[PDB]
């Protein structure tokens, strides 16, 4: 049992800080998390009794207060976990000065189409030079690794992990939330993406205006990072379609599992490739229909007519096509999800998954 | 001529920045001087009319740092990025490597245990050796210490600190008014002109003194310039323990060393550590003084003992009270030994001749 140190930028509980949860949760007894940040992700790893600690700015590691205090820290620890982009530049640093060997977990799609040059630059080359291991979430995400010029003999996919027990809820509980949703009568499409142009939200909207009227969408998830503009952008397309009474934004929420069970229809509409795709394993696991954007990940989450639907990213006629696919074949549809179910259960169980981190950073 | 971006890392006018002047002065038109604090070096390069900016740590990557995101971003606008010290030897690479533009390194320091931590000789030598096509070093000294630390001997070229050799001239008037102004007309006196850090040695011509007879007496120009304000109360107990609080004054930091060392007697460096190259000494050689020096580093390429100036064991106060006496005593030796120090140096350290070894370095890549 080795001692962590896991590093994250953010103090906001994203995809990546999520899974970052699953992983570290077994190790915590000898753990740490960094966050470069403060937040409800915090909070979360409290509750799930991970030891956790901010760095911060304030005051030759006088050019960086943060990195010089990350640096003291791995003197404690036998490996870096770095989890995210900043996480790999502190981490890179920390693991030549205080000479511990540092492994880079991707989340992301590192391509022109979702960063700029230089942060792709960045992390191909502190990759390349400093990490022993380059965890990639996808097979999409290892290639985007790959073809950006990372080493191809640093990576291994490792799908994110679920927790399968978390994604029941009884029939009475949907119908009393349905209820409080006030959608009891209506056919449901939820979108549950953290709000931002990439993630597809106005792609869904312009599909609602093509279904049949009693379709109705439910946003859940809050602008994480200040795209405060597209959410005005959202409520002014809402109101020029007539939609007005026909999409509920949730803010940010907790009980996903029971607003996915809630819901008709999972719709994912990244207009950029999803590197994984949370989203679209949940509403698996919860045994509900999923429509995915045809990119990315999602590929490889979903066989199309068998375990969801995938469309073309960008095409809100398509997304429209399969939601009426979903009212009217019901049967198919069910059996589509129940199929989900089964293959998402075997696929991405937690347990499974932490096992192959296990053996990974054992084989170091 | 090609456009540099020089980057220091300090507003103070040290050795490495009072160097820096004269190594940048002839790219001025197309130069800039980036430093990462505000001081009087920021003065002195306005008054050699040499473009100056002053970077600071307030505000994607950048957040961590904002200091390197202004330098990255000031970086596109240059053909060459000079490092000056070590933190610019650190932001000098990463902005290399993001605004993709060579990078030189210029080598003041002895990379070695006794002068820095071990974290800042593994990040100077591999940055140095990643990131520099050139490290300029400031003596063999310096060179050598920098291979045995890791350094990639390729990369070097050793080019000695260049002087205006018409700085270096004052009137006998001046000179008699000087040593009046001071009190000390009729003294023997003693010059040290490093700055206040231990290792310059400001102690060991203390100890000297006492053994040296009443009318030898010391000024030490210099002041703590990077927080050494224990150092300074150490040498004022000092002073006060032995009977000398009337035969040592400090004046603090002065413009005027030309000046200073006409009105001494005798140069004195005494650094308990290796001396990378010795600004003080070539100064003093080029003022036609005496001048003793510590034998370690470049001092010693700097120094023939008995032919251009003195050398003694480093830390030992009794040679260098003997080396003083020996001055007394042996004046027509001591002015020859004076007098051909300056004609050496004068060749040899001539800002036009170094000037020139920088341009052909620079031009040859
Ligand atoms: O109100 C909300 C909205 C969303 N979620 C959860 O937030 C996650 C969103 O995940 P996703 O959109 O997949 O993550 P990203 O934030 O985009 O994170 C990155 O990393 C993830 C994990 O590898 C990948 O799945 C993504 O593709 C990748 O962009 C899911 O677990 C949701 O259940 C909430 O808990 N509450
Ligand atoms: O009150 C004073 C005292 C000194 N000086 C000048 O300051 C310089 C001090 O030079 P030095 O002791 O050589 O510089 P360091 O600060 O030690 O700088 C580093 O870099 C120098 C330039 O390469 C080398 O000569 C040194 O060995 C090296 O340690 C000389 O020009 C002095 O004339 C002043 O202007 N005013």
Redesign the interface.
């Known amino acids: 049992h080795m001692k962590i140190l896991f590093l994250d930028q953010s103090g906001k509980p994203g995809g990546a800080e999520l899974c970052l949860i699953d992983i570290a949760k077994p190790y915590r007894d000898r753990a740490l998390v960094g966050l470069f940040a403060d937040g409800a992700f915090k909070t979360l790893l409290e509750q799930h009794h991970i030891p956790v600690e901010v760095f911060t ?1 304030q005051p ?1 590691g ?3 207060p ?2 010089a205090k990350v640096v003291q820290t791995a003197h404690e620890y036998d490996l870096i976990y770095a989890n995210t ?2 996480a790999l ?2 981490g890179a640093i920390a693991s ?2 205080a000479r511990r060997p540092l492994v880079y977990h991707l989340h992301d799609i590192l391509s022109p189409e979702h960063f ?1 040059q ?2 792709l ?2 992390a191909v ?1 502190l990759a390349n030079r400093f990490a022993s291991l380059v965890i990639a979430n996808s097979q999409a995400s290892q290639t985007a690794f790959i073809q950006a010029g990372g080493r191809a003999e640093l990576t291994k996919v490792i799908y994110n992990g679920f927790d399968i027990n978390l994604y029941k809820t009884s029939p009475s509980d949907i119908s009393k939330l349905r209820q409080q949703l006030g959608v009891a009568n209506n056919f449901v499409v939820g979108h549950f993406s953290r709000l931002s142009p990439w993630k597809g939200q106005h792609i869904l909207i312009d599909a609602l205006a093509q279904c049949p009227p009693q379709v109705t969408a439910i946003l859940v998830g809050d602008a994480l990072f200040g795209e405060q503009d597209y959410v005005k952008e959202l409520h002014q397309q809402i109101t020029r379609l007539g939609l007005e009474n026909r999409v509920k934004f949730l803010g940010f929420r907790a009980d996903i599992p029971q607003l996915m069970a809630a819901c008709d229809l999972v719709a994912h509409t990244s207009t950029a490739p999803e590197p994984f795709g949370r989203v679209i394993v949940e509403a698996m696991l919860c045994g509900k229909p999923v429509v995915a954007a045809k990119a990315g990940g999602a590929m490889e989450l979903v066989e199309h007519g068998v375990n969801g639907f995938l469309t073309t990213p960008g095409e809100s006629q398509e997304l429209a096509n399969i939601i009426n696919t979903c009212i009217e074949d019901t049967q198919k549809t069910a059996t589509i999800a129940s199929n989900a179910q089964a293959i998402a259960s075997q696929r991405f169980d937690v347990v499974t998954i932490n096992q192959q981190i296990a053996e990974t950073l054992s084989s170091l």
Request: no cysteine; glycine share 0%.
């Open positions: 700015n030759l006088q050019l960086a943060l990195v982009q900043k530049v502190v030549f000065i700029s230089t942060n630059r960045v080359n």
